[PDB]
């Protein structure tokens, strides 16, 4: 039962389900203590059973229980753990992650097969903890907290921050991803190249594997953090290492529309 | 009484409780029919139950009656003025002791909480709970700066003497967690209250001197 910034209270549907069960349980105790007739006791016991059913699994038996003033069924324990929006598929098999970005993709014809064009401003936010350490190491900032204040305001960012960011990303790779990820080539690791602008530059030879065109598609960027995560991406997931199709063994990074035409 | 926060069967069972009370207090000597005297107790039991069980955040009966009366007065003025009354018109019609501030506070109290599972948009894949941050647990940035400050403060306290460092860490609650006093620390070392404030002031002055000569501790403030 949380208080939002506006002062309003927001609560889950389980509190209403628990309250009904407690109200009916307490009333049954009072009726039993008063020696009420069997008809009254039987109706109260039947309601107590239905309150337990609604709490455990709402809508399985009978009319679903809805909050008064609306026709939306209350979310029970069973509904929490089941379905495409349940705990398993929404929070356990997949999650939202830190150190992740997204932007529009454009074609980079000058890139190497293992390179991508990462915007400077995305790279600054993605590699922020690494950047703060590097700024502290040099004379840019006295400590990390002072360094973080510098990056908060855009007009306070000096020109040596970009040099430090260039040093931070040296050798490291990022994961580019385009949804839907139909096969494992829907995630590929690239060595970022800092570019001016706001769009990610994608190599032409990897468009077929990503099933990406340049009519407004968007891609996600992920930063593996440890040496294991970097080693796996640089060795196993690198674009220049996955040239054949796992399905058939035929080339998957091969000359395409304009390249074929010129040759 | 349906549609006032309680389901039909809940109203019936609460009404049954009033019916049991009516039988206990009913007197047949007065030659009144039972339905005459039972109707009072059945309505009372149903109405009280609504006042007690219709809100997730319980509001006392006296305050519920205030809200009901305030709603009626606003409704009467609304149909008579041909528009929504302001808080001043409501307060004036309520009577003595009521001003616009009290009306606003009462209306603020009468606000039901909103469900965390209410969908937004035609697509049934977004809810209120997905847009409410958790502001209780410290963030990774907040945890890191707390540890950085602790590490820097420990290094600054190294320059102090063995006993001067202990006094400040006891008086500021850096050891047991809770602040001690001049007497309590005085019992720990066998010294009186007056000496401790002098050495603590001296030790604090030295920390100011060291911090001034380095400026390695001003960012955390």
């Amino acid at each position: 039962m949380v208080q939002v910034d506006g002062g309003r209270f927001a609560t889950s549907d389980l509190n209403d389900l628990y309250r009904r069960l407690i109200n009916r349980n307490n009333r049954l105790k009072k009726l039993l203590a008063q020696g009420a007739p069997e008809i009254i006791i039987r109706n109260e016991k039947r309601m107590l059973q239905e309150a337990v059913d609604a709490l455990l699994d709402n809508g399985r038996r009978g009319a679903p229980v809805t909050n008064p003033g609306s026709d939306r069924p209350l979310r029970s324990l069973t509904d929490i753990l089941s379905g495409k929006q349940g705990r398993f598929r929404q929070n356990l098999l997949g999650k939202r992650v830190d150190y992740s970005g997204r932007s529009v993709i454009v074609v980079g014809p000058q890139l190497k097969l293992h390179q991508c064009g990462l915007p400077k401003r995305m790279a600054l936010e993605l590699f922020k903890p690494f950047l703060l350490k590097k700024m502290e190491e040099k004379g840019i900032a006295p400590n990390v907290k002072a360094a973080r204040r510098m990056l908060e305001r855009q007009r306070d960012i000096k020109d040596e921050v970009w040099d430090a960011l260039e040093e931070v990303i040296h050798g490291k790779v990022v994961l580019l991803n385009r949804a839907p990820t139909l096969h494992r080539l829907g995630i590929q690791a690239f060595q970022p190249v800092l570019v001016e602008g706001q769009s990610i530059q994608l190599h032409p030879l990897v468009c077929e594997a990503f099933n990406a065109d340049f009519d407004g598609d968007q891609m996600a960027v992920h930063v593996p953090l440890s040496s294991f995560a970097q080693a796996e991406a640089r060795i196993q997931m690198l674009s220049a290492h996955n040239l054949l199709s796992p399905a058939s063994g035929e080339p998957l990074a091969k000359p395409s529309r304009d390249i074929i035409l010129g040759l | 009484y349906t549609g006032r926060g309680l389901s039909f069967l809940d109203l019936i069972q609460e009404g049954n409780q009033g019916l049991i009370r009516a039988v206990e207090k009913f007197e047949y000597k007065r030659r009144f029919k039972f339905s005459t005297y039972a109707t009072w107790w059945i309505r009372q039991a149903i109405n009280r139950a609504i006042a007690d069980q219709a809100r997730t955040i319980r509001i006392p009966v006296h305050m519920v009656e205030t809200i009901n009366k305030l709603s009626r007065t606003a409704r009467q003025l609304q149909q008579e003025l041909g528009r929504e009354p302001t808080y001043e018109e409501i307060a004036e019609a309520m009577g003595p002791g009521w001003d616009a501030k009290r009306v606003e506070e009462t209306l603020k109290i009468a606000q039901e909480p909103v469900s965390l599972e209410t969908p937004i948009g035609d697509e049934k894949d977004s809810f209120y709970g997905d847009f409410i941050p958790d502001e209780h647990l410290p963030s990774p940035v907040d945890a890191a700066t707390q540890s950085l400050l602790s590490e820097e403060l420990e290094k600054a306290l190294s320059k102090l003497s063995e006993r001067e460092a202990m006094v400040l860490k006891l008086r500021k609650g850096l050891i047991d967690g809770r602040e001690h006093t001049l007497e309590e620390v005085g019992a720990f070392f066998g010294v009186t209250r007056e000496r401790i404030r002098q050495i603590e002031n001296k030790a604090l002055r030295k920390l100011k001197y060291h911090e001034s000569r380095t400026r390695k501790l001003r960012d955390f403030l």
Binding site: I39, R42, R61 | L9, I12
Partner: peptide
């Protein structure tokens, strides 16, 4: 399956 109908039937006896 309808608790209200079941209760009304019971009190009708």
């Amino acid at each position: 399956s309808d608790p209200v109908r079941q209760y009304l039937h019971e009190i009708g006896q």
